[PDB]
Amino acid sequence: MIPLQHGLILAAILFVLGLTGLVIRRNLLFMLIGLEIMINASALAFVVAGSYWGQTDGQVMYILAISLAAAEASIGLALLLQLHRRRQNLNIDSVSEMRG
Amino acid sequence: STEVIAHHWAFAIFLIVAIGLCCLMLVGGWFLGGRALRLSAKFYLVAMFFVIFDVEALYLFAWSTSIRESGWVGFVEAAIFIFVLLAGLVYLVRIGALDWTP
Amino acid sequence: MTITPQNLIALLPLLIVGLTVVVVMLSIAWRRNHFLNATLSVIGLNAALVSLWFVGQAGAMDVTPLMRVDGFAMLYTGLVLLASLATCTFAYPWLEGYNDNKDEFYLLVLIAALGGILLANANHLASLFLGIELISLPLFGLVGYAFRQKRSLEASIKYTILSAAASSFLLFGMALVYAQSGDLSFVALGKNLGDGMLNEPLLLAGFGLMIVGLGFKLSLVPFHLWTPDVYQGAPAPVSTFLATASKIAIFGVVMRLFLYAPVGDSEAIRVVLAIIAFASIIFGNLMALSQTNIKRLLGYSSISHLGYLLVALIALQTGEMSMEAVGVYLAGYLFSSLGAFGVVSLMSSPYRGPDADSLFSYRGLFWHRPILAAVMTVMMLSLAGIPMTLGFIGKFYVLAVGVQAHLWWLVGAVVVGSAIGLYYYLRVAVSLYLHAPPSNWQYSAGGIVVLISALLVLVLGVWPQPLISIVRLAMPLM
Amino acid sequence: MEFAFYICGLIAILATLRVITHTNPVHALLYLIISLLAISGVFFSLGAYFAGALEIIVYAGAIMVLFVFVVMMLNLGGSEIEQERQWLKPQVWIGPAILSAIMLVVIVYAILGVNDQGIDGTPISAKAVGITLFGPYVLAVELASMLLLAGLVVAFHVGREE
Amino acid sequence: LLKRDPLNSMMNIPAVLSRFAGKGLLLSENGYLRWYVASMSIGAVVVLALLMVLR
Ligand SMILES: CCCCCCCCCCCCCCCCCC(=O)OC[C@H](COP(=O)(O)OCCN)OC(=O)CCCCCCCCCCCCCCCCC
Ligand SMILES: CCCCCCCCCCCCCCCCCCCC
Incomplete structure (x- = not known):
C-alpha cells in the first residue's frame, strides 16, 4: 500500500543531499x-522500482550497484591514502596543478 | 495470520527489551557509586581485500540458496566465478599482498 | 533465456579476453615478467580479433536477456580490440622506464577491453551500466598508474570522483526509467505508451540523467571540463586508450540504445541532444585555439569530434545512413587518435621518472624524427576534415546526415568548428617543421603501428569504398 | 509496514543531513551507518529482504568499516578542517543548496506525474533473486566478478606503502 | 582612407570574436574538482529543465 512515488522522492532527497555534500x-x-550517499540513493531507487513491479530485476541491479559502490569506495580511499601520503x-x- | 503478527510483536519486544536492558544497565552503572605512531597501509589492504571478497561472497550467498533450481548450468557459472575468485586470491598471495611481515 | 553452444560461440571474444585476463594473472603470480605478460595480453587480444571471424560465421542472434550479437557488435568489438592492441604496443616502451611493477597495466587494459566488448554487445540497461563501469575502473587504474607523478595522481583523483558522480547520476536515471517502464530491455523503454504520450515526465527525467552520465563519458558540454586535465595528466598510452576505446564503446552502446528505445524518437530528447552537440562542437573547437600542450588540445579535439558524432546521432530516426556514418566516422577517428597519441607516446617513451616533466616539444620534430613528424602531420590533417583523409570522409558523412534531416544549425556549427579546428591543427602541423634547439623492436613496433595508421588514413581517404562497404556490411537487427 | 517505511526514511534523511554538515569524520561515518541501517529498514518494509540483508552485511558491514579504517589510520584531528568552518559560511553553501533544491523540485515534479498503483510489499525472497542472478543474468555475475577483480588490482597498485 | 583595407578588418572581426570567446571559455578550466562537480550538477539541472519545458 506504500506509494512508489514516495520511495522515489526519498531516493531523490538522499541523492541531492549526497550531491550537496x-x-x-x-x-x-x-x-x-x-x-x-549518491550511489546508495540510486540503489534505493532501483530497489523501490523493482519492488513496485514485483521483479527481481531491482535487487539484481542493486547487487551490481553495491558491487560498483564497494569497488569505487576502495578506489577512492586508495587514492585518498596516496594523496595524504605524498602531500x-x-x-x-x-590539488589543481594543471588548468586551462 | 495471527502467528505472523504475534511473531513480529515478539521480535519487536526482543529488540526493544535487549536495547533497553543494555541502556538501563549503562544508566545504573553511571548512577551508582561515589567519586573521588603512523599506521601502515597493510590494514587498508586487508580491509579492501575483505570488502572485495565479501562482495564476491554475497554473489555466492545469492547462488547457494538456489542451487537446485539453477541446475548444472548454474553450477558451471559458479565454477567460473569461484575459479576467477581463486585466481585473484592466488595472485594476491603470490605477490606478497597478503603477507604481513616482509 | 539459457545459453546454447551457438550462444557460446557467439560469446567468443568475451570468453577469450576473460581467459586471457585469468592466464595473465596466473603468469604474474608465477613470476613477474614484463615481456611474457605483454605477449600473453597481445596474443589474447589478437585471438579475440580473429575469433570475431568465427562469431561472424555464427550469425546474428540474442545472447542473453542482456546481450545481442550482430554486425554492430562485430564492428565495435573490432574497433575496441584494435585500440587495446595499439595501447599495449605503445605501453611497452613507456613501461620499459617504469621502476615500479609493470604487469598490472596489461591486466587493466584487458579488463577495459572486456568492458568495451560488453558495451559493444550490450542490449540491456544492466549490461550498459556494467560495461560503463568495466571501462571506467581500469581507466581509474591506468590514468593514475604513475601515482608518484603529481599530474597523473591529480588526473586519477579528478577522473575517479567525477566518474563516480556520473555513475550515480546514470544509475539514478536508469532507476527512474525502470520505475516508468518496468522492463530493463533496450527495446522496452517506452513500449507501454501510445497515442502520443511518449513524453512521460519520469521517463524523460531518467533519460536526461543517463544523458548526463553518458555526456560525461563522451566529453559532451557541459560535462567536458575533465577532458584536458585527465588527458594531460594520464600516461600517453592511457590517453590513447581513453581517447579511442572508451569513447567508441560508449558511443556504440548509446547508438544501440537510441536506435532500439521507442522513446528515442521523442522530440524533446532530440532538441536537448541538438543543443548539447552544438555547444560541444563550438566549445571544444574554441577552447583549443591557444593550447601549447598537445594533450589538452587533443582533449578539446575529442570534445569537438564527439560533438560531430552526436550531430550524426541526432538524425538516427530520420536518415538511413546515420549509423553507417557513425561507423565510418568512428573508424576514421580511431585511426586519427591512434596515430596522434601514438606519436605522443613514442616521444614520451620511456618513462623518465615521476619528478621530470613529460613535455612534448613538438617544434622541429622533423629534423630528428622525420617519419614520426610525417605521421603526426598526416593525422593532424586527418582530424581537420581535410580531403584525402579518412577524417574528411567521416566529416562528409556527418555533413550529408545533417543535410538530410534539415538540422542546419548543427551543420553551421560543423562548418565553424571545422574552421577553428583548421586553425589549430594547421598550427600544430606547421610547428612540426619549424626550427628548435628506442634501440629496441618494441619502439619499432609502435612506429610501425602509427605508420600503418597514417597509411590507412591516406589510402581510405583517397579510396574510401572498402571501408564504406565494410561498415554497410555491419548491419544490426531492426 | 508503511509506518516503518516512513519512520526509517525520515531517520535516513536526518542522518544523511547530519552527515553532510558535520566536521568530525567518525561522527559523520556513524551517522552514515545509522542512515544505512534506516535504508535497510526501508528495504525490509518493501519486501526486498535481500537488499536490506546486503545493505547491513556489505554496505554497513564492509564499506563503512573500510571508511572507519581509513579515518582512524589517518588520525584525522581536524587539522585545517575543524578550524576552518568553511562549509557553514552561507557564501559557500547557499548556492549549491539552492541548485540541489531546484533539481529536487524538478525530479519531484517528474516523479509525481507517473502511474502509481502503490507497492503491495510482497516479500521477494533471496531464492528468486539467486534464480534470476544465475539464470538470465549470468554474464552480469561474471563481469561483475571481473569488475571487483579490477578494483582490487587497482587499489592494491595504488595503496601500497613501499 | 582605404590604405588600411577596412573590408579585410571587417572580415577579420570574426577571428577576433572567436579568440575572445575561446579566452572567455578557457576560464572554466580552472582545474578545481569542486567546480567540475558543480558544473556537472548545473548541466544536470539544465538538461532536466529543458526536458521538462519541451515535454
Ligand atoms: C517510535 C518513535 C521513534 C523512537 C526512536 C527511534 C526508534 C527506531 C525507529 C525505527 C525502527 C522501528 C520502526 C517501527 C517498526 C515496527 C514494526 C513494523 O512496522 O512492522 C511492520 C513490518 C512487519 O513485516 P510485514 O510482513 O510487512 O508486516 C505487515 C503486517 N501485516 O515491518 C517490516 O516489514 C520491516 C520493519 C522495519 C525493518 C526492521 C527494523 C529496522 C530498524 C532500523 C533502525 C535504524 C536506526 C534507528 C536509530 C534511531 C535513533 C538515532
Ligand atoms: C593532404 C594529405 C597529406 C599528404 C601528405 C602531407 C605531408 C606529409 C609529410 C611528408 C614529409 C614532409 C617533409 C617536409 C620537408 C620540409 C623541409 C623544409 C626546409 C626549409
Missing part, C-alpha cells in the same frame, strides 16, 4: 562519503 565539502573524504593534506582545492 559532495559539492560543498573541500575534504576528499567527505567527497567520497557524499559519493557513497600530507586532503585539500581538494589545493
Whole structure:
C-alpha cells in the first residue's frame, strides 16, 4: 500500500543531499562519503522500482550497484591514502596543478 | 495470520527489551557509586581485500540458496566465478599482498 | 533465456579476453615478467580479433536477456580490440622506464577491453551500466598508474570522483526509467505508451540523467571540463586508450540504445541532444585555439569530434545512413587518435621518472624524427576534415546526415568548428617543421603501428569504398 | 509496514543531513551507518529482504568499516578542517543548496506525474533473486566478478606503502 | 582612407570574436574538482529543465 512515488522522492532527497555534500565539502573524504550517499540513493531507487513491479530485476541491479559502490569506495580511499601520503593534506582545492 | 503478527510483536519486544536492558544497565552503572605512531597501509589492504571478497561472497550467498533450481548450468557459472575468485586470491598471495611481515 | 553452444560461440571474444585476463594473472603470480605478460595480453587480444571471424560465421542472434550479437557488435568489438592492441604496443616502451611493477597495466587494459566488448554487445540497461563501469575502473587504474607523478595522481583523483558522480547520476536515471517502464530491455523503454504520450515526465527525467552520465563519458558540454586535465595528466598510452576505446564503446552502446528505445524518437530528447552537440562542437573547437600542450588540445579535439558524432546521432530516426556514418566516422577517428597519441607516446617513451616533466616539444620534430613528424602531420590533417583523409570522409558523412534531416544549425556549427579546428591543427602541423634547439623492436613496433595508421588514413581517404562497404556490411537487427 | 517505511526514511534523511554538515569524520561515518541501517529498514518494509540483508552485511558491514579504517589510520584531528568552518559560511553553501533544491523540485515534479498503483510489499525472497542472478543474468555475475577483480588490482597498485 | 583595407578588418572581426570567446571559455578550466562537480550538477539541472519545458 506504500506509494512508489514516495520511495522515489526519498531516493531523490538522499541523492541531492549526497550531491550537496559532495559539492560543498573541500575534504576528499567527505567527497567520497557524499559519493557513497549518491550511489546508495540510486540503489534505493532501483530497489523501490523493482519492488513496485514485483521483479527481481531491482535487487539484481542493486547487487551490481553495491558491487560498483564497494569497488569505487576502495578506489577512492586508495587514492585518498596516496594523496595524504605524498602531500600530507586532503585539500581538494589545493590539488589543481594543471588548468586551462 | 495471527502467528505472523504475534511473531513480529515478539521480535519487536526482543529488540526493544535487549536495547533497553543494555541502556538501563549503562544508566545504573553511571548512577551508582561515589567519586573521588603512523599506521601502515597493510590494514587498508586487508580491509579492501575483505570488502572485495565479501562482495564476491554475497554473489555466492545469492547462488547457494538456489542451487537446485539453477541446475548444472548454474553450477558451471559458479565454477567460473569461484575459479576467477581463486585466481585473484592466488595472485594476491603470490605477490606478497597478503603477507604481513616482509 | 539459457545459453546454447551457438550462444557460446557467439560469446567468443568475451570468453577469450576473460581467459586471457585469468592466464595473465596466473603468469604474474608465477613470476613477474614484463615481456611474457605483454605477449600473453597481445596474443589474447589478437585471438579475440580473429575469433570475431568465427562469431561472424555464427550469425546474428540474442545472447542473453542482456546481450545481442550482430554486425554492430562485430564492428565495435573490432574497433575496441584494435585500440587495446595499439595501447599495449605503445605501453611497452613507456613501461620499459617504469621502476615500479609493470604487469598490472596489461591486466587493466584487458579488463577495459572486456568492458568495451560488453558495451559493444550490450542490449540491456544492466549490461550498459556494467560495461560503463568495466571501462571506467581500469581507466581509474591506468590514468593514475604513475601515482608518484603529481599530474597523473591529480588526473586519477579528478577522473575517479567525477566518474563516480556520473555513475550515480546514470544509475539514478536508469532507476527512474525502470520505475516508468518496468522492463530493463533496450527495446522496452517506452513500449507501454501510445497515442502520443511518449513524453512521460519520469521517463524523460531518467533519460536526461543517463544523458548526463553518458555526456560525461563522451566529453559532451557541459560535462567536458575533465577532458584536458585527465588527458594531460594520464600516461600517453592511457590517453590513447581513453581517447579511442572508451569513447567508441560508449558511443556504440548509446547508438544501440537510441536506435532500439521507442522513446528515442521523442522530440524533446532530440532538441536537448541538438543543443548539447552544438555547444560541444563550438566549445571544444574554441577552447583549443591557444593550447601549447598537445594533450589538452587533443582533449578539446575529442570534445569537438564527439560533438560531430552526436550531430550524426541526432538524425538516427530520420536518415538511413546515420549509423553507417557513425561507423565510418568512428573508424576514421580511431585511426586519427591512434596515430596522434601514438606519436605522443613514442616521444614520451620511456618513462623518465615521476619528478621530470613529460613535455612534448613538438617544434622541429622533423629534423630528428622525420617519419614520426610525417605521421603526426598526416593525422593532424586527418582530424581537420581535410580531403584525402579518412577524417574528411567521416566529416562528409556527418555533413550529408545533417543535410538530410534539415538540422542546419548543427551543420553551421560543423562548418565553424571545422574552421577553428583548421586553425589549430594547421598550427600544430606547421610547428612540426619549424626550427628548435628506442634501440629496441618494441619502439619499432609502435612506429610501425602509427605508420600503418597514417597509411590507412591516406589510402581510405583517397579510396574510401572498402571501408564504406565494410561498415554497410555491419548491419544490426531492426 | 508503511509506518516503518516512513519512520526509517525520515531517520535516513536526518542522518544523511547530519552527515553532510558535520566536521568530525567518525561522527559523520556513524551517522552514515545509522542512515544505512534506516535504508535497510526501508528495504525490509518493501519486501526486498535481500537488499536490506546486503545493505547491513556489505554496505554497513564492509564499506563503512573500510571508511572507519581509513579515518582512524589517518588520525584525522581536524587539522585545517575543524578550524576552518568553511562549509557553514552561507557564501559557500547557499548556492549549491539552492541548485540541489531546484533539481529536487524538478525530479519531484517528474516523479509525481507517473502511474502509481502503490507497492503491495510482497516479500521477494533471496531464492528468486539467486534464480534470476544465475539464470538470465549470468554474464552480469561474471563481469561483475571481473569488475571487483579490477578494483582490487587497482587499489592494491595504488595503496601500497613501499 | 582605404590604405588600411577596412573590408579585410571587417572580415577579420570574426577571428577576433572567436579568440575572445575561446579566452572567455578557457576560464572554466580552472582545474578545481569542486567546480567540475558543480558544473556537472548545473548541466544536470539544465538538461532536466529543458526536458521538462519541451515535454
Ligand atoms: C517510535 C518513535 C521513534 C523512537 C526512536 C527511534 C526508534 C527506531 C525507529 C525505527 C525502527 C522501528 C520502526 C517501527 C517498526 C515496527 C514494526 C513494523 O512496522 O512492522 C511492520 C513490518 C512487519 O513485516 P510485514 O510482513 O510487512 O508486516 C505487515 C503486517 N501485516 O515491518 C517490516 O516489514 C520491516 C520493519 C522495519 C525493518 C526492521 C527494523 C529496522 C530498524 C532500523 C533502525 C535504524 C536506526 C534507528 C536509530 C534511531 C535513533 C538515532
Ligand atoms: C593532404 C594529405 C597529406 C599528404 C601528405 C602531407 C605531408 C606529409 C609529410 C611528408 C614529409 C614532409 C617533409 C617536409 C620537408 C620540409 C623541409 C623544409 C626546409 C626549409
